[PDB]
């Protein structure tokens, strides 16, 4: 086509979606990771994670307001990945990289799994 | 912080949100622009438009599944702006620029209003 494109649009959209999350505006699901609860927007979760895409495209699960993750999932790892979904920034540290990588494999977030593998290989 | 950032994340999120819209997945509102209907995600509309942000933060309107726009709004202008929200690309043409600019002023999409004003000034 003959379209023009606003370079910062996608980043500005994501920043506003994170502001809605901060302010608990139109959040429509609670993700439970053992004793912790995280509120989010189903559409953002599906856009970022192959696991959430499969969950919320299922005719029965699409209607649930609470999703319980596998008890082996670390809440801090999940929190770091949820922040990444809404900001593009990943708080990867020596003390959390194994939990983050395990959580990203479970959530099916291939680009995160890729950077974790590279950072782990560099330390070996 | 000491975060790393994935450059393409925001664009990839927006591309997936547009794929959900295409496939009518988790759309939660119908916008009516005279005889036409457009399905969308409230969160994307709020993230892009000052008018939708005000509508869906209102305690009564946040619960509506149908929103009727002012009868003066052109459906093609709205369609072009809805595509811009989900893609960052604006199909601006000599034959649609006045309707697009009028619609962006109504929806409170300041960056679009800005490029329309510049393209109009260049033709004068």
């Amino acid at each position: 086509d003959s379209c023009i494109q606003f370079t910062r649009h996608a980043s500005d959209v994501l920043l506003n979606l994170n502001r809605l999350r901060s302010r608990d505006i139109l959040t429509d699901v609670v993700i439970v990771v053992s004793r912790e609860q995280f509120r989010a927007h189903k559409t953002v979760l599906m856009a970022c994670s192959g696991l959430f895409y499969s969950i919320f495209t299922d005719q029965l699960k699409c209607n649930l307001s609470v999703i319980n993750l596998d008890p082996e999932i670390n809440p801090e790892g999940f929190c770091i990945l949820l922040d990444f979904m809404y900001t593009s920034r990943l708080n990867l540290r020596e003390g959390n990289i194994m939990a983050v990588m395990a959580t990203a494999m479970y959530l099916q977030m291939e680009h995160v799994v890729d950077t974790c593998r590279k950072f782990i290989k560099a330390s070996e | 912080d000491s975060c790393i950032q994935f450059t393409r994340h925001a664009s990839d999120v927006l591309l997936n949100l547009n794929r959900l819209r295409s496939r009518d997945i988790l759309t939660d509102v119908v916008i009516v622009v005279s005889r036409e209907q457009f399905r969308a995600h409230k969160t994307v509309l709020m993230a892009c438009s000052g008018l939708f942000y005000s509508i869906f933060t209102d305690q009564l309107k946040c619960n509506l599944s149908v929103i009727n726009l002012d009868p003066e709004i052109n459906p093609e202008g709205f369609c072009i702006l809805l595509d811009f929200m989900y893609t960052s690309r604006l199909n601006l043409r000599e034959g649609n620029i006045m309707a697009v600019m009028a619609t962006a002023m109504y929806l409170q999409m300041e960056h679009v209003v800005d490029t329309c004003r510049k393209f109009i000034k260049a033709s004068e």
């Binding site: 379209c3 023009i4 494109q5 606003f6 370079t7 | 690309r89 604006l90 490029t115």
Partner: peptide, 4 residues
């Protein structure tokens, strides 16, 4: 704004 750019030409994509």
């Amino acid at each position: 704004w750019v030409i994509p």
